[PDB]
Design a binder for this molecule. Structure first.
Ligand code: ARG
Ligand code: ARG
Lengths: 337, 337
């Protein structure tokens, strides 16, 4: 497999669940300052075999993601899938949100965006009725196109954590790495040059946040990035193992740069051709390497019967201080004027 | 204080020492692949109050370093200070080398350089007879000028760990942050521009490595960086809290750029004026923030009687994958053709 996989024993899974439940009892919320600070140390109490996996697999050169299988989820206890992310912090999902944050603490510094889902650190992925054909993660009938998470931003995550609360019909997450086996050197050269525009995706629009937030000064920075994007490279670092920054629906070549356009067009076709599926079954967690891979989600027919697919999500950086310019009165919720 | 300080209780210090001693019994060496991989997980067994300090203090916005006081060191057990770093992996210093690596594992990914002290991850700082007036860390009579560690390299450490094995005469480490209170905005503007040359320091020369290593292809990259340095910025990131990349003895303005030169000259004087002292007494460990501060060491008269000042040192990055281009057949020992 192109990802690294770990399966918890039932005993390990129960121990991790018990730890998350204890945290849920002792702390008021996941995104509170106290649990944000404490979670990385509390995570040291997770099962040792899991801690070893996370410490080693993060340092491997190859995987597109780290996948942890086997966290129990009781649908009766969980309750119905929320109709919107706003109302998605349900008591039934609370322990699992704490669990995701504990796992994330083993990989780095968690953070959110002032301009996405009301500045929440733990976010939700679920289908919103009426929003089936949008470019945001609450779509369904329209495939969520492949992307580097928050591609527009230099402060985008190193890892994106996804915990599947439920996924009864096995809807696939999509993944692709750099198509290095098919990129000729001239095309590769051009992708390494600062000749591309990457604009913020629609999740950072005021319309996709609550009316109270509309509001925040950080939406100004989003507008600046959308209106006047700075040319950047799609590939960076080592030519034999490049890091990737692209969004199929929000990337463009620099104004009138047809050579850059050709390179982006070639990249699109090669990523489309190599895209593969990872199904996060109920209880599965994935930490996608946001530098090695783009990801998306297959089109699916939403149910709207209370049992729709539902993920908790979290952004993770290896170094919070990289984003200090965007510390919006809060180091864990990023944005700029 | 401009650094964050933690003092171990005797019980905590003894527990940490016992853990390091256990590691020293079970592993062949600190730089072996096994302990490199295991140390970050074994470090989860360190005293909880220390783990909390390291997890929180790393995320604070202000400190120039994280300092841990109170590790016991028995001079009789330690033995005499080595005459050279080559011979400095003495049995008496072995547990303390493991201790340094355990502490470092709480902050990030440790690594070394193919071209410095024979590619060792745990390195040594001690005075070498005949080398009193050099620009390397084995100097004594000549002050070690302030510097960002490995300033020339984009893969330089985020944190530099220093453990004082002995320092009987209390020789000071020097530190300085960005002199933001005195830099005018025009000068600040220029320091943020890619108008400066930073060459590799003398520790990366073949003459300062063993004759067997002279040898390695990675010295080619050092020569390239010395002969044809690429213009880079001294300050990066947030203008209200910039990150710093400079070396007093190995920095220069870009060819004929007198405005850049003026900015560097002003910076020199302001750093010289704000330089302060941190004395690492026997058993003290410091993790210097290599982005917020430059550091050095005061001139001292060497003893050469077997009780000279002696530190173990280690480079730490928040993300090993940042340096994958420089993974020299080994992700933990960096260098390039
Ligand atoms: N090509 C795209 N649709 N990009 C945007 C991805 C989805 C966005 N990050 C969200 O959570 O809604
Ligand atoms: N300005 C300087 N002397 N810079 C070089 C610093 C010392 C070097 N990192 C060493 O270990 O020897």
């Amino acid at each position: 497999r192109p990802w690294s996989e770990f399966r918890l024993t039932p005993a390990e899974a129960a121990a991790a669940a018990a730890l998350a439940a204890r945290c849920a009892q002792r702390y008021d919320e996941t995104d509170g300052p106290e649990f944000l600070l404490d979670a990385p140390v509390i995570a040291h109490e997770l099962p040792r075999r899991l801690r070893t996996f996370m410490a080693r697999a993060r340092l491997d050169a190859w995987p597109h993601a780290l996948v942890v299988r086997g966290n129990p989820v009781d649908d009766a206890a969980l309750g119905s899938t929320p109709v919107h992310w706003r109302t998605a912090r349900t008591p039934g999902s609370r322990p699992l949100s704490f669990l995701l944050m504990l796992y994330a603490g083993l990989l780095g510094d968690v953070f959110g965006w002032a301009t996405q889902q009301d500045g929440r650190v733990v976010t939700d992925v679920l289908p919103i009725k009426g929003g089936e054909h949008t470019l945001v993660s609450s779509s369904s009938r329209q495939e969520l196109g492949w992307h580097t998470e928050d591609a527009f931003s230099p402060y985008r995550a190193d890892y994106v954590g996804l915990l599947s609360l439920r996924n009864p019909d096995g809807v696939a997450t999509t993944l692709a790495g750099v198509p290095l086996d098919d990129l000729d050197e001239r095309t590769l050269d051009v992708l390494f040059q600062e000749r591309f525009l990457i604009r913020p995706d629609d999740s950072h629009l005021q319309v996709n946040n609550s009316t109270a937030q509309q509001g925040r000064v950080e939406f100004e920075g989003i507008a600046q990035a959308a209106d006047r994007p700075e040319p950047v490279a799609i590939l960076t670092g080592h030519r034999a193992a490049p890091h990737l920054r692209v969004d199929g629906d929000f990337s463009a070549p620099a104004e009138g740069d047809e050579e850059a356009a050709a390179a982006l067009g070639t990249l699109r076709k090669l990523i489309d051709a190599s895209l593969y599926e990872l199904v996060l079954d109920q209880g599965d967690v994935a930490f996608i390497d946001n530098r090695r891979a783009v990801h998306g989600r297959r089109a699916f027919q939403p149910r709207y019967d209370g049992r729709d697919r539902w993920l908790k999500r979290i952004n993770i950086t290896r170094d919070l201080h990289r984003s200090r310019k965007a510390w919006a009165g809060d180091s864990r919720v990023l944005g700029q004027r």
